[PDB]
């Protein structure tokens, strides 16, 4: 959906991205998401991946914790709970989801399975530090 | 192998389904889409390939997974208000 | 019979709205949205306003809905196109669409300014630890 | 073509700093003279 | 001695700052440089082919210019060309 | 200079290393001061919400009798529980009666008050004259603005599909850019100043 979103974009910035996109990287694109993560990790900051925010956060909280998410979200979409057309589990399910969201359940589960189970942590001055001039003191 | 049924599955969606069924008040049995792919139609065959198929063909009664909300699916499926908003984002090497 | 609320930049009255008669004086985000919605659905609409609360809510005693929700429940309007928040109580009495704009709580601060220079800002180029090591290296030498 | 002013080499520091530099020079010199030539030691 | 050290170092450092900044200064040399910046205002004749060209433009940069154009200068636009020349001459580089 | 310099090898060693140290340190001071005076960098004290809870110098409050306060009240996350404790034990009243009141309270003060509100109005105001505010950190809640309809209207499915189509193609993003960033006063270098007393 990301390639389609960029291709079919009417915005200036993403239009410029698409103009750059499909260039001679040779291959900025990728086939597997794990492939993109590995490529970014191998590259010494020379590659940036575009992906869903949730997975970006999860990966950021995964060992070795050598990658980060930066910036806001280019697009805006959602994940939902599906029932077949003409089912009796339509209204009750939507009501339950909304009640959970107001009660804060979903945010708590998010924090639990993204941060309270992350291998990594939870979370300035340009003044010269003693590490810069240590050799002088030695 | 130690646990059988739903007790062997752990994750966000599992607890979400637990809470949802608790509020609705129904018993549920989990499974997994054999195709292991999210719903999508064959352009020529006009057949859905994934959990959307397991829903619209009567195989399944509800889907609790990261189903992206789209126009193609919303026509043949009844979604719920998003439980997780989301977007495209930028991933970079963590500056050492 | 669509509905709207003056909360900007969703609904606002265009400059020199006395000249404009109706459905063209208004400007904003919700109005363009209603235009596109009507285009994709076909129906014709006349933008309106309600006041009387400016949004949906319920009085526990009166048990009567007010605002856009109140009028939609009671037939005074066809649909409401506005920054109307999705909530449990409202979905029980009306039907929402999928969100056309997702948001959340955030933090507003005053922009950091060029701080008034502090007395002893001439030490800032070096950290305090460097200065103390300098003092004690002077002593030791 | 902005013609640089003569005494543009003073621009890095404000006029007040130069003024108070002169004042502090005078005070330092006087205090040195005093604390060096007061005690009949 | 301490006072002297601080003062001389400050003089040298601020002079370096002055010269470095005076060396960064890249004047306007293209439509893009004018487009991104906003410290200078730019406007064309009120009625003419230039206003139409910008309004009816499908290009990114001139689209951004038009988005800026018709702003609260109050009036970037002008009625007479001599008026525009005089306005640019009076402005201390604040109009293009 | 010096009215005396050492004549022995040991004293001369000491003096030489002291001289090297002095040279390096003075050069570093001058160079880093030149950096400071050449590049202005204003750091926001806050880049998140935990930073806001730990800080006590900065005060923060919501709009009184609103959904945001109801959110903080019934919260289960630790950080927001701490914020609720603070806001319930705060003198004077951090809370406010109107949005404009909170905006004015933030603007009049100088980095002392932080206002918790919706992302959309914050983004809008960050583009208003005076452009003396900005939004910091991420979002502490998820919500959406939705088109409504009476129960049983034939307009439900069409409007759902219309908003979904618009989102997929990209109309809504363009409208947001048009009414928030474009049509926005301040978008997104100053000569160096002489040092003052
Ligand atoms: N229904 S879906 O929309 O099929 C979809 C649903 C759920 C997760 C997806 C996903 C897609 N996608 O687009 O293919 C790509 C993708 N990529 C990742 O890296 C990741 O973590 N999760 C996903
Ligand atoms: N449905 S709503 O929920 O009625 C509601 C809808 C839309 C915008 C709201 C708003 C509420 N509110 O909470 O009362 C407060 C508020 N405060 C602001 O500062 C702002 O910009 N927008 C809003």
Curated annotation (Swiss-Prot), chain A:
Residues 1-132 are extracellular. It is found in: Cell membrane; Endoplasmic reticulum membrane; Postsynaptic cell membrane; Postsynaptic density membrane. The modification Phosphoserine is found at residue 43. L-glutamate binds at residues 1-2, 52. It comes from the Eukaryota. Phosphorylated at Ser-43 by PKC. Detected in cerebellum (at protein level). Disulfide bonds join 65-120. Homotetramer or heterotetramer of pore-forming glutamate receptor subunits; heteromeric assembly can be the result of both receptor subtype and flip-flop forms and according the composition, one partner can be dominant with respect to the fast desensitizing current component, whereas the other can determine the steady-state component. Tetramers may be formed by the dimerization of dimers. Found in a complex with GRIA2, GRIA3, GRIA4, CNIH2, CNIH3, CACNG2, CACNG3, CACNG4, CACNG5, CACNG7 and CACNG8. Interacts with HIP1 and RASGRF2. Interacts with SYNDIG1 and GRIA2. The M4 transmembrane segment mediates tetramerization and is required for cell surface expression. Ionotropic glutamate receptor that functions as a ligand-gated cation channel, gated by L-glutamate and glutamatergic agonists such as alpha-amino-3-hydroxy-5-methyl-4-isoxazolepropionic acid (AMPA), quisqualic acid, and kainic acid. L-glutamate acts as an excitatory neurotransmitter at many synapses in the central nervous system. The postsynaptic actions of L-glutamate are mediated by a variety of receptors that are named according to their selective agonists. This receptor binds AMPA (quisqualate) > L-glutamate > kainate. Belongs to the glutamate-gated ion channel (TC 1.A.10.1) family. GRIA1 subfamily. This is Glutamate receptor 1. The chain holds residues 668 to 811 of 907 of the full protein.
Swiss-Prot record, chain C:
Detected in forebrain. Detected in dendrites of neuronal cells. Expressed in the pyramidal cell layers of CA1 and CA3 and in the granule cell layer of the dentate gyrus. Changing residue 88 to Y: Promotes dimerization. Strongly reduced desensitization. The record marks 58 as: Interaction with the cone snail toxin Con-ikot-ikot. Palmitoylated. Depalmitoylated upon L-glutamate stimulation. Ubiquitinated by RNF167, leading to its degradation. L-glutamate binds at residues 83, 85, 90. It comes from the Eukaryota. It is found in: Cell membrane; Postsynaptic cell membrane; Postsynaptic density membrane. Belongs to the glutamate-gated ion channel (TC 1.A.10.1) family. GRIA2 subfamily. The postsynaptic actions of L-glutamate are mediated by a variety of receptors that are named according to their selective agonists. This receptor binds AMPA (quisqualate) > L-glutamate > kainate. This is Glutamate receptor 2. It comes from Rattus norvegicus.
């Amino acid at each position: 959906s990301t390639k389609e979103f960029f291709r079919r974009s009417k915005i200036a910035v993403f239009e410029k991205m698409w103009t750059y996109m499909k260039s001679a990287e040779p291959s900025v694109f990728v086939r597997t998401t794990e492939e993109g993560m590995i490529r970014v990790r191998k590259s010494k900051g020379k590659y940036a991946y575009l992906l869903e925010s949730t997975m970006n956060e999860y990966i950021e909280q995964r060992k070795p914790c050598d990658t980060m998410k930066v910036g806001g979200n280019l697009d805006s979409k959602g994940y939902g709970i599906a029932t077949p057309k003409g089912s009796a589990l339509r209204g009750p399910v939507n009501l339950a989801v909304l009640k959970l969201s107001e009660q804060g359940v979903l945010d708590k589960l998010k924090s639990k399975w993204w941060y309270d189970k992350g291998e990594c942590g939870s979370k300035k001055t340009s003044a010269l530090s003693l590490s810069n001039v240590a050799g002088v003191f030695y | 192998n130690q646990f059988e049924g739903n007790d062997r599955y752990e994750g966000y969606c599992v607890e979400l389904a637990a809470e949802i069924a608790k509020h609705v008040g129904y018993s549920y049995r989990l499974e997994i889409v054999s195709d292991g792919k999210y719903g999508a139609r064959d352009p020529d065959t006009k057949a859905w390939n994934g959990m959307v198929g397991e829903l619209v063909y009567g195989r399944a009664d509800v889907a609790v997974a990261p189903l992206t909300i789209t126009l193609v699916r919303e026509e043949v499926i009844d979604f719920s208000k998003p439980f997780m908003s989301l977007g495209i984002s930028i991933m970079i090497k963590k500056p050492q | 019979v669509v509905t709207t609320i003056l909360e900007s930049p969703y609904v606002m009255m265009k400059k020199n709205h006395e000249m404009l008669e109706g459905n063209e004086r208004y400007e904003g985000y919700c109005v363009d949205l209603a235009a596109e919605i009507a285009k994709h659905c076909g129906f014709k609409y006349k933008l309106t306003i309600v006041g009387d609360g400016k949004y949906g809510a319920r009085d526990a005693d009166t048990k009567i809905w007010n605002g856009m929700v109140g009028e939609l429940v009671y037939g005074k309007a066809d649909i409401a196109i506005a920054p109307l928040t999705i909530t449990l109580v409202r979905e029980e009495v009306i039907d929402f669409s999928k969100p056309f704009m997702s948001l959340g709580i955030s933090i507003m601060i005053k922009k950091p300014q060029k701080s008034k220079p502090g007395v002893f800002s001439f030490l800032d180029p070096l950290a305090y630890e460097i200065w103390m090591c300098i003092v004690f290296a002077y002593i030791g030498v | 073509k902005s013609k640089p002013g003569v005494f543009s080499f003073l621009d890095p520091l404000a006029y007040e700093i130069w003024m108070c530099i002169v004042f502090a020079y005078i005070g330092v010199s006087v205090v040195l003279f005093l604390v060096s030539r007061f005690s009949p030691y | 001695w301490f006072f002297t050290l601080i003062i001389i170092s400050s003089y040298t450092a601020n002079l370096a700052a002055f010269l470095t900044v005076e060396r960064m200064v890249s004047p306007i040399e293209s439509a893009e440089d004018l487009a991104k910046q906003t410290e200078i205002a730019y406007g064309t004749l009120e009625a003419g082919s230039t206003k139409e060209f910008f309004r009816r433009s499908k290009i990114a940069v001139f689209e951004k210019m038009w988005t800026y154009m018709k702003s609260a200068e109050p009036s970037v636009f002008v009625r007479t060309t001599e008026e525009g020349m005089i306005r640019v001459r009076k402005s201390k580089g604040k109009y293009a | 200079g010096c009215d005396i310099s050492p004549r022995s090898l040991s004293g001369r060693i000491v003096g030489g290393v002291w001289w090297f140290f002095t040279l390096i340190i003075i050069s570093s001071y001058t160079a880093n001061l030149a950096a400071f005076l050449t590049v202005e960098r204003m750091v926001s004290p806050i880049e998140s919400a935990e930073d806001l809870s730990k800080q006590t110098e900065i005060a923060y409050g919501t709009l009184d009798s609103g959904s945001t306060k109801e959110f903080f009240r019934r919260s289960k996350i630790a950080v927001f529980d701490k914020m609720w404790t603070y806001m319930r034990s705060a003198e004077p009243s951090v809370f406010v009666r109107t949005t404009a009141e909170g905006v004015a309270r933030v603007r009049k003060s100088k980095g002392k008050y932080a206002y918790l509100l919706e992302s959309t109005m914050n983004e809008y105001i960050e583009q208003r004259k005076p452009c003396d505010t900005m939004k910091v950190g991420g979002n502490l809640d998820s919500k959406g603005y939705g088109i409504a309809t009476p129960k049983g209207s034939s307009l439900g499915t069409p409007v759902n599909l219309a908003v979904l189509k618009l989102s997929e193609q990209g109309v809504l993003d363009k409208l947001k850019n048009k009414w928030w960033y474009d049509k926005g006063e301040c978008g997104a270098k100053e000569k160096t100043s002489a040092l003052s007393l």
